[PDB]
Amino acid sequence: VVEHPEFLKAGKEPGLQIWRVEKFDLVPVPPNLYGDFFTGDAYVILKTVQLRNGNLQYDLHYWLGNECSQDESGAAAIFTVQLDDYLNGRAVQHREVQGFESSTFSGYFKSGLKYKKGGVASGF
Amino acid sequence: VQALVVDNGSGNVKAGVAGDDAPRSVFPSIVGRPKDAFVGDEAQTKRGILTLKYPIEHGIVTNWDDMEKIWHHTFYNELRAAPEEHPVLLTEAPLNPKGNRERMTQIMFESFNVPAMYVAIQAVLSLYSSGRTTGIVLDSGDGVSHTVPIYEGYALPHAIMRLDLAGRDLTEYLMKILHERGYGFSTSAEKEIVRDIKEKLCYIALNFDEEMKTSEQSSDIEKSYELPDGNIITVGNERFRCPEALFQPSFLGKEWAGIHTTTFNSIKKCDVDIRKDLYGNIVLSGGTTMYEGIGERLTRDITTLAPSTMKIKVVAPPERKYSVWIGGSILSSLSTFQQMWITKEEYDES
Ligand SMILES: Nc1ncnc2c1ncn2[C@@H]1O[C@H](COP(=O)(O)OP(=O)(O)OP(=O)(O)O)[C@@H](O)[C@H]1O
Ligand SMILES: [Ca+2]
Ligand SMILES: [Ca+2]
Ligand SMILES: [Cl-]
Ligand SMILES: [K+]
Ligand SMILES: [Mg+2]
Ligand code: NA
C-alpha cells in the first residue's frame, strides 16, 4: 500500500505536512492555510523531525472537526494507519479533537490553532 | 468500479455498495430447505414447508453449503450485482480461524469468480467508523459478543475475548421470563415477535437492585405492546431484567463473566503502557448495544473494576448498529483500497 502519490511524499524531510480528507482521498492543504482548520472537516498531519543521529522521527495526528462527517473522520483514522504502515510503523499516532488538541499539536503552529465554519462536502 | 460490502452477521447479513452511509440490504442469515433453498425473509414466510438453519450461528461459518446460498442471495436477489464484476469486502469475526478465512476466500474466487476481495475484522471496521485507531470495541450482535482491543490500527489477538451471549440469548430469556405473567411464546414466529418486544421496550438499569425496588413501588414500569393479532401485552420489570443478563449471565444459568468484567479482562491482557488509551476509548458496536442506559451502566461498572487512576469513557455512536458495515464502506471507498485487496489472478496462481 504505497503507490498513493501523497504517501510517496510523506516524511522525506523535516517539516510539517497537512492533508484534508476530501471525498475519500488525502488532499494536500494549501500551505497558506496551515493552522486554520474547517470545523466541518477531518485532517491528517505528519510532523517529521530530524534526530541527532540523522534518522527521522514521525508523529501522525488526525484532527476531527466538530462538524465533520463520519466518512471524513473514519477515513482520517484509516489513512493515519496506512501512512504509519508506509513509515514502517515508526510513527506515533495521535487523535486530536477540535478544542481539545494536545499541546504538542498546537505547538506546531506559531499563530496557534484556529477554526473556520464550513468544509468540503461529505463523500456519503 | 464500486466495491460491494458484505457483513456476515450471525443473525442478519448487512450488504450494500461502498460509499453509502448504510447497508441497503439487511436480511436474516437463515437458509430454509424443503421438508430447493430459500434465504432470508422469504425463508421465514415459508417456515411451514421448510426446515430453517443458521449457517453462522456464533459469528463463525459452520455450514458452507448454506453460507454459499446466503452469498448467492446477497449478490443476485438483494443487490442484483454480478459478483464476478465487483471487488468485494467481506467481514469476519474476531479470532476467526485462518482455515475458515481460506475457505471463504476459495468460495469467493472459485464459485463466485470475484475479481478482487479483502477480508476485514468486524471490530476493526467499527473502531474506524468511530474515527479512532486505538480503543477497545465491545461488539454485541445476535449470536456472539466480542471485546477487541486495538492499538494504532491493529487488533491485539492475545487480548480478544469471545462471549457466546448476545441478542438471541436475550430474546430467549425474555421468552422465558414472560411465562411469569402467563405468556407462552415458544415457536420460531413467536420468537420474532418477542425479539421486537425486546427491542421496543427493554432498557438497561443504571443500578439493577435499585431499579427492582423502584419498579415494584408502582405500575409506572409497565409498558404496552400491540401484538400482530391485535392483543396488547404489558411488560413490567422484564423490560430491564432481560438485558441485565448481559451483566449477570447467571440469570441464564451460566458462570460466564458479564460484559463489564469481560471488557476489563480484555484490557488487562494488554500491556500496562497502553491501557489508558483503551479505557478512554471503549466503543460500543452492534445491535445488542442499542439498549437505552447501556453507556451509563457500563461506565459505572467498568469504573468500579478498573484502577481509579484510569479515565473511563464509553462511546455509544448513534449509528453503531451498522458500524461494521459503515467502516467497510469507508475503507473500500478510499483511494488506497485497490492496493489492499487480493486479485483472483494472484489467488489462482498462489
Ligand atoms: N434497539 C435494539 N435494542 C436491543 N437489541 C437490538 C436492538 N436492535 C437490534 N437488536 C438486536 O441486535 C441483534 C442483531 O444485531 P447484529 O445484526 O448487529 O447482530 P449480527 O451482527 O447479526 O450477529 P453477530 O454480529 O453476533 O454475528 C438482534 O438480536 C436484534 O434483536
Ligand atoms: Ca466536511
Ligand atoms: Ca506506529
Ligand atoms: Cl475502581
Ligand atoms: K458480534
Ligand atoms: Mg455483527
Ligand atoms: Na483513560
Author numbering:
A (entry chain G): 2 to 125
B (entry chain A): 6 to 40, 52 to 366
Give the original sentences from the paper that presented this experimental model.
Actin is the constituent protein of microfilaments with essential roles in central processes in the cell, including transport, cell division, and motility. Outliers of this functional consensus are actins of the phylum Apicomplexa, including Plasmodium spp. and Toxoplasma gondii—both notorious human pathogens. With less than 80% sequence identity to their canonical counterparts, actins of these parasites are among the most evolutionarily diverged eukaryotic actins while still retaining most of the core features. Here, we analyze phosphate release rates and high-resolution structures of wild-type and mutant Plasmodium actins in different nucleotide states, bridging the gap between structure and function in understanding the polymerization mechanism and the instability of the parasite microfilaments.
